[PDB]
Amino acid sequence: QRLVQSGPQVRKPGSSVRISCETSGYTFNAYILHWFRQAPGRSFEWMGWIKPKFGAVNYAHSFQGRITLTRDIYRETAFLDLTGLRFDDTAVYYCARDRLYDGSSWRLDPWGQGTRVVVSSASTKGPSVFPLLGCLVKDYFPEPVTVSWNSGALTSGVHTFPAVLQSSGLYSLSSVVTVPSSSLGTQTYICNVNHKPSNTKVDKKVEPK
Amino acid sequence: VWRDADTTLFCASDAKAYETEKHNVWATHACVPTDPNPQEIHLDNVTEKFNMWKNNMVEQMHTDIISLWDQSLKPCVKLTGGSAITQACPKVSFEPIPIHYCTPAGFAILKCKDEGFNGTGLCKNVSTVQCTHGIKPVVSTQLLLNGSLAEKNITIRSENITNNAKIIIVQLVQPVTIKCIRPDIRQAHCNVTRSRWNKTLQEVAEKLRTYFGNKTIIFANSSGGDLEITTHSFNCGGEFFYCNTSGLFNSTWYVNSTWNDTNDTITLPCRIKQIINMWQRAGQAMYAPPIPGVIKCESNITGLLLTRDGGKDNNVNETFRPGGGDMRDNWRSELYKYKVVEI
Amino acid sequence: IQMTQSPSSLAVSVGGRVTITCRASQGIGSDLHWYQQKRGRPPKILIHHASAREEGVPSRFGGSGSHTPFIFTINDLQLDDVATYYCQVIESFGQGTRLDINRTVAAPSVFIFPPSDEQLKSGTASVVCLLNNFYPREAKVQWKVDNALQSGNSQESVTEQDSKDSTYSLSSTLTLSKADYEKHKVYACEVTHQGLSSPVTKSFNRGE
Ligand SMILES: *[C@@H]1O[C@H](CO)[C@@H](O)[C@H](O)[C@H]1NC(C)=O
Ligand SMILES: *[C@@H]1O[C@H](CO)[C@@H](O)[C@H](O)[C@H]1NC(C)=O
Ligand SMILES: *[C@@H]1O[C@H](CO)[C@@H](O)[C@H](O)[C@H]1NC(C)=O
Ligand SMILES: *[C@@H]1O[C@H](CO)[C@@H](O)[C@H](O)[C@H]1NC(C)=O
Ligand SMILES: *[C@@H]1O[C@H](CO)[C@@H](O)[C@H](O)[C@H]1NC(C)=O
Ligand SMILES: *[C@@H]1O[C@H](CO)[C@@H](O)[C@H](O)[C@H]1NC(C)=O
Ligand SMILES: *[C@@H]1O[C@H](CO)[C@@H](O)[C@H](O)[C@H]1NC(C)=O
Ligand SMILES: *[C@@H]1O[C@H](CO)[C@@H](O)[C@H](O)[C@H]1NC(C)=O
Ligand SMILES: *[C@@H]1O[C@H](CO)[C@@H](O)[C@H](O)[C@H]1NC(C)=O
Ligand SMILES: *[C@@H]1O[C@H](CO)[C@@H](O)[C@H](O)[C@H]1NC(C)=O
Ligand SMILES: *[C@@H]1O[C@H](CO)[C@@H](O)[C@H](O)[C@H]1NC(C)=O
Ligand SMILES: *[C@@H]1O[C@H](CO)[C@@H](O)[C@H](O)[C@H]1NC(C)=O
Ligand SMILES: *[C@@H]1O[C@H](CO)[C@@H](O)[C@H](O)[C@H]1NC(C)=O
């Protein structure tokens, strides 16, 4: 038993997205498959199940008319359709098999690795990097960005924060580090930022003035 | 005395050895003749548990009806698995006959005679018989055809009525006639009496409220899936009919609603397909075009297969849609009052 | 059908016997299951059918109860058990319990950062307030501009708990237009936290 899902996808509001759930390791026809989304921090929400043999489906609540669960009986891949992508639909989506052979018990043993979905009315753009010690990495899209200090030579006192999503639809994060005060006049400090999706790398020296 | 066990059963029938119809032909070699005077004995002061959902008779029957179909209706092309089969695919006569199931020596069938028995729990009136009643193996979705009817009240049977993943079998008291015909030589349609059907939905709704509470009951069409389950699918004269039930499942029933609220015929559009998804097995099958002439089969509606929508729990209403696809549920609807024991 | 999971959070060090209670709508019998998920990972079944264990993780994990209330128990907590836990009944999930390890309450160090010259020239001002190495995770960060409390115009970020000192760190970022920024003088970040007997304020004057 094993369920591999689609890779992370980022779509624009109003459009539609399709998520696949590739099935291996077990009898694909004799196991009820469920679909869950998880808001950043919040608990899991049930979207709907689908009994694979006939595509017998069951959507839920506010999802009806926006969601469609289908499967490709050959290659044994299951799908999840999400139309009219609202902003608040931005989450990670899961597929999980009911453990019970021929029947339901709602025991969920195998889970997808999670399909990260971002709904932003934005186009890919590399960050501007400004000085604050630390570096401010503002207005980039999409995730992710990585940051090091002094080419990897500085690995102590560093805290690299999780990105936030701005109302603009762009991400921002900060990276900070603590060091002895007496060194600021004598030690050079450089943050090295790489944003491969836009192929943007920046080295920004930061000093008092 | 006895204790529960599963074993291999045999079937009995009144099939005609001279008939060319395929159910008859199969049953002639597969089954024995029926008993003129079957015996039923009341078991005094006996109380017994039944479970229609874990009754191995269903599975045995299933394997039998699969075999019946496989050797009777050969497709021009089969895609079971990754392997594809080409073959001769003649037209046949195909019209279900009643089958009885009987226990061999050393085993017995118990029969619950409790009114409106839900299929799971203690039966107060138990009897023993050598053989079941005659059950026609009608293959269909959404609607159960030519089956047994409830004696007094509409009956709901479910493993967990509150588990939206569980099928819901409904049994009617009064049957609803369904009349189908083929006059695009693939175009067909089925008629049901509007008035007769609406009275049915009103009483079903009222019965359903006893389980889900004093709530509004909504009937709606299937949310998706293969055509076999999103339509009322069945076979007639060896041909596979697929009928649209949108006209049947498109109503909202408040606690005070009556069919009298707000031709007398609902006409359902149907299609005959040559390319079909098998119920026996994962895979696709292709048949020959339909035979010339008028094709008709008037049937009795004797039950329903429903599912209930999930969601974030909200009083006021519940929504139900037709379902099915697993033919074991068809068999369960008939075998629910029987269980096998070893002596 | 409807879940309520207590407590919302919790913090026990290596060893302490943990107990989580999930209460629900009227009757569910024994059909409550128990999960566990780590940061960036999908959940995993631990206990099913209200009492039963399953193959995999040990049977130091357990559950008991019937009808409405249920209890999830870890008799001997280890280090890798630190994860968020959830109780589920069919379509319904618990709110979720964020587990944690206990530690001596450590107050945050607070820093404020003005907008850079480079940033201002582009039409936006970001102001950053840093909270470094504190415990517990709960903290209140309030932006004040000329003594007027600011809300809805700030964002917080928190690091995952540090593997070596078991502390958290947090950033808060206030974003304003240049035009609005130049209209006000005093910019302040006020921090409230359990390890501080009173709130700490850091501030600066524009152009100073
Ligand atoms: C059992 O049979 C008796 C007489 O036939 C009847 O009065 C009684 O109601 C039956 N019990 C049930 C549970 O139907
Ligand atoms: C079915 O009826 C029996 C009594 O004959 C009862 O014990 C049981 O709880 C009922 N089950 C359902 C699902 O209605
Ligand atoms: C079905 O109803 C339509 C309209 O009343 C009628 O024309 C048609 O002949 C009917 N077919 C059957 C089989 O009753
Ligand atoms: C359902 O509501 C009706 C109101 O018309 C009432 O008469 C009936 O007693 C109610 N049933 C309950 C509360 O079980
Ligand atoms: C079910 O009804 C809807 C009306 O909202 C219709 O669009 C849809 O095609 C129907 N589905 C089927 C399978 O007939
Ligand atoms: C069933 O009929 C409705 C309208 O009567 C139509 O919208 C729907 O597409 C039909 N379904 C199929 C599967 O043809
Ligand atoms: C469904 O019901 C509405 C009224 O409730 C009616 O206007 C519509 O024609 C119906 N559709 C079908 C396919 O029966
Ligand atoms: C019947 O009762 C329901 C609620 O009990 C109400 O919503 C509805 O309006 C009533 N029927 C009519 C025709 O008003
Ligand atoms: C049900 O029985 C009738 C006999 O009157 C037959 O004509 C019809 O074809 C049967 N239904 C099916 C689906 O075979
Ligand atoms: C059931 O269907 C048959 C089909 O010919 C019909 O003759 C019979 O009248 C129907 N049942 C009832 C009670 O009308
Ligand atoms: C059922 O309830 C939901 C939410 O209370 C509502 O949106 C919907 O319109 C209701 N159904 C009907 C047929 O009124
Ligand atoms: C399923 O039904 C049984 C009794 O038939 C009940 O004890 C159990 O709680 C139900 N499961 C649920 C509500 O998840
Ligand atoms: C955590 O440890 C502190 C001592 O540093 C103690 O005062 C506190 O009660 C402990 N908390 C728990 C939940 O054990």
The DSSP-derived string for chain A is: -EEEEPPPEEE-TTS-EEEEEEEESS-TTSS-EEEEEE-SSS-EEEEEEEETTTTEEE-BGGGBTTEEEEEETTTTEEEEEE-S--GGG-EEEEEEEES-SSS----EEEE---EEEEE-S---BPPEEEE--EEEEEEEBSS--EEEEGGGTB-SSEEEPPPEE-TTS-EEEEEEE---GGGTTTS--EEEEEEGGGTEEEEEE----
**Among A99, A89, A3, CA closest to A38:** A89
Distances (CA, A) of A160 to A26, A136, C37, C139, C161: 41, 11, 23, 19, 12
C159 Cβ under 8 Å from any chain A Cβ: yes
Tell if the CB–CB gap between C171 and A161 is shorter than 8 Å: yes
Dihedral angle, C-alpha B116, B117, B119, B124, nearest 10 °: -170
- Same domain? For C137 and C147 the reply is yes
Calpha distance B213→B227 (Å, rounded) = 32
Amino acid at C125: A
Residue B299 in contact with ligand 9 by CB distance below 6 A: yes
If one counts every other C-beta atom within 10 angstroms of the C-beta of residue C62, the result is 17
- Of residues C24, B260, C156, C95, the one with CA closest to residue A38: C95
What span, in angstroms and rounded, lies between the C-alpha atoms of C61 and C56? 11
Strand partners, A58: A49
Contact yes or no for B163 and C90 at CB 8 A: yes
Residue among B313, B314, B315, B318 with most chain C CBs within 10 A, to mutate:
B313
Nearest neighbour of C155 by CB, restricted to A43, A134, A164: A164
Beta bridge partners of A154: A149
Catalogue all structural domains in chain A, each as residue range(s) with its CATH number.
1-121 (2.60.40.10), 122-209 (2.60.40.10)
Method: X-ray
Helices B22-30 and B56-72: crossing angle in degrees, nearest 10, is 120
Sign of dihedral through CA atoms B172, B175, B176, B180?
Answer: positive
CA distance B301 to B136: 13
C159 contacts on A by Cβ (under 8 Å): 159-162
Pick from C87, C103, C119: which residue ends a domain? Answer: C103
Asked if the C-beta of A175 comes within 8 angstroms of chain B's C-beta atoms, the answer is no
CATH number at residue C99: 2.60.40.10
Whether A114 contacts A6, CB under 8 Å: no
For C30, the token pair is 């024994």
Q: Is B248 helix (H, G, I), strand (E, B) or coil?
A: coil
Which helix (H) or strand (E) element contains residue C69? strand C69-74
Interface of A with C in 15-54 (CB under 8 A): 43-46
Residues flanking ligand 7, CB < 6 Å: B 246-247, 250
| CB-based contact A55 B229, cutoff 8 Å | yes
**C173-177 own/partner pairs: CB under 8 Å, 24+ apart:** C173/A164, C173/A172, C173/A174, C173/C126, C173/C127, C173/C128, C173/C129, C174/C126, C174/C127, C174/C128, C174/C129, C174/C143, C174/C150, C175/A166, C175/C124, C175/C125, C175/C126, C175/C127, C176/C124, C176/C125, C176/C127, C177/C123, C177/C124, C177/C125
Q: Is residue B105 within 8 Å of residue B72, measured between CB atoms?
A: no
Q: Residue C24: give the domain boundaries.
A: 1-103
Residue A208, phi-psi category: left (phi > 0), alpha (psi -120 to 50), beta (remainder): alpha
Please count the structural domains in chain B.
Answer: 1
Please tell me whether residues C89 and C132 are part of one structural domain.
no
**Among C103, C123, C147, where does a domain finish?**
C103
C3 and C93 housed in the same domain = yes
Both tokens of B175, joined, read 């049957």
C-alpha to C-alpha distance for C208 and B211, rounded to whole angstroms: 73
Alpha-carbon distance of C39 to A55, in angstroms, equals: 33
Residue C156 neighbours by CB under 8 Å, 6+ apart:
A164, C141, C170, C171, C172, C173
Q: How far is CA C37 from the centre of its chain?
A: 15
Give the Cβ contact number of residue B2 at 10 Å: 11
State how far the Cα of C65 lies from the Cα of A63, in Å rounded to an integer: 34
Q: Sort B82 into a burial class: Cβ within 10 Å, 0-12 / 13-18 / 19+.
A: exposed
Read off the DSSP letter of residue B52: G
Residue C108 per-residue DSSP state: P
Bridge-based pairing of strands A115-119 and A9-11 is parallel
How many domains in chain C? 2
Closest CA relative to residue C86, chosen from C75, C78, C77, C95: C95
Among B233, B238, B241, B286, which Cα is nearest to B21's?
Answer: B238
Q: At which residue do the structure tokens 């759930």 appear? A: A21
C53 in contact with A at a CB cutoff of 8 Å? no
Dihedral sign, Cα of residue B43, residue B47, residue B49, residue B52 = positive
Report CA torsion sign: A31, B162, C8, C149: positive
Last residue of a domain, one of C47, C79, C103: C103
Q: C32 is written with which tokens?
A: 């409550």
Does C8 reach chain A within 8 Å, measured CB to CB? no
Single out the residue of C50, C60, C104 nearest to residue C81, CA to CA: C60
Containing structural domain, residue B303: 1-343
* Distance from the alpha carbon of residue B94 to the mean position of ligand 12, in angstroms: 41
- Find the helix packing angle between B328-335 and B56-72, rounded to 10°: 130
The verdict on C94 and C124 lying in the same domain is: no
CA distances from C113 to A174, A190, B33, C153, C204 (A): 11, 17, 94, 16, 9
Taking the C-alpha atoms of residue C154 and residue C174, their distance in angstroms, rounded to an integer, is 4
Of residues B41, B37, B2, the one with CA closest to residue B127: B41
Residue that is written with structure tokens 């009757």 in the block: C27
Helix, strand, coil percentages for chain C (3-state, nearest 5): 5, 45, 50
Task: Tell me whether residues B226 and A29 touch, CB distance under 8 A.
Answer: no
Question: Which residues have C-beta within 8 Å of that of residue B18, sequence separation ≥ 6?
Answer: none
How many other C-beta atoms lie within 10 A of the C-beta of residue A126?
A: 20
Contact between chains at B163 and A103 (C-beta distance less than 8 A): no
CATH code of the domain covering residue B196: 2.170.40.20
Within 8 A by CB and 6+ apart from A62, the residues are: B311, B312
CA C31 – ligand 12 centroid, Å:
7
B314 touches chain C (CB under 8 A): no
- C84–chain B nearest CA distance, Å: 23
Burial pattern B12-25, b for ≥16 Cβ within 10 A else e, equals bbebeeeeebbbbb
Surface-to-core class of residue C140, CB atoms within 10 Å of its CB (0-12 exposed, 13-18 middle, 19+ buried) = exposed
Residue B134 neighbours by CB distance under 10 Å: 16
Q: How many other C-beta atoms lie within 10 A of the C-beta of residue C202?
A: 15
Q: Residues, chain C, total?
A: 208
Tell me, yes or no, whether C45 and C112 share the same domain: no
The HSE-up count of residue A126 (CA atoms within 13 Å, CB side) is 12
Mutate to test the pocket of ligand 12, among C1, C26, C28 (most ligand atoms within 8 A of CB): C28
Q: After which residues, if any, is chain A broken (C to N > 2.5 Å)?
A: 132
One domain, residues C171 and C94: no
Looking at the structure, do residues C136 and C198 belong to the same domain, yes or no? Answer: yes
Show the tokens assigned to C90.
């069919």
The CA-CA-CA angle for residues B31, B32, B37, to 5°, reads 135
Give chain C's largest Cα–Cα span.
67
Question: B110 and B254 in contact (C-beta within 8 Å)?
Answer: no
C124 and C93 fall within a common domain: no
Query: Coil, strand, or helix at residue B79?
Result: strand
Q: In whole angstroms, what is the distance from residue C195 CA to residue C135 CA?
A: 8
Do both C110 and C189 map to the same domain? Answer: yes
Q: Output the CA–CA distances (angstroms, integers) from residue C117 to A14, B268, C196, C206, in the order listed.
A: 38, 73, 33, 12
Give the integer Cα–Cα distance in Å for A58 and B220. Answer: 12
* DSSP secondary structure letter of residue B54: G
> C29, C66 in Cβ contact below 8 A?
yes
Residues in chain A: 209
**b vs e for A36-60, b when ≥16 Cβ sit within 10 Å of the residue's Cβ?**
bbbeeeebbbbbbbbbbbbbbbbbb
Which bin fits B136, alpha (ψ -120 to 50), beta or left (φ > 0)?
Answer: beta
Across B235-269, b (16+ Cβ under 10 Å) vs e yields bbbbbbbbbbbebbbeeebeeebebeeeeeebebe
Ligand nearest to the Cα of B221, by number: 5
Contact B308, B25 (CB under 8 A): no
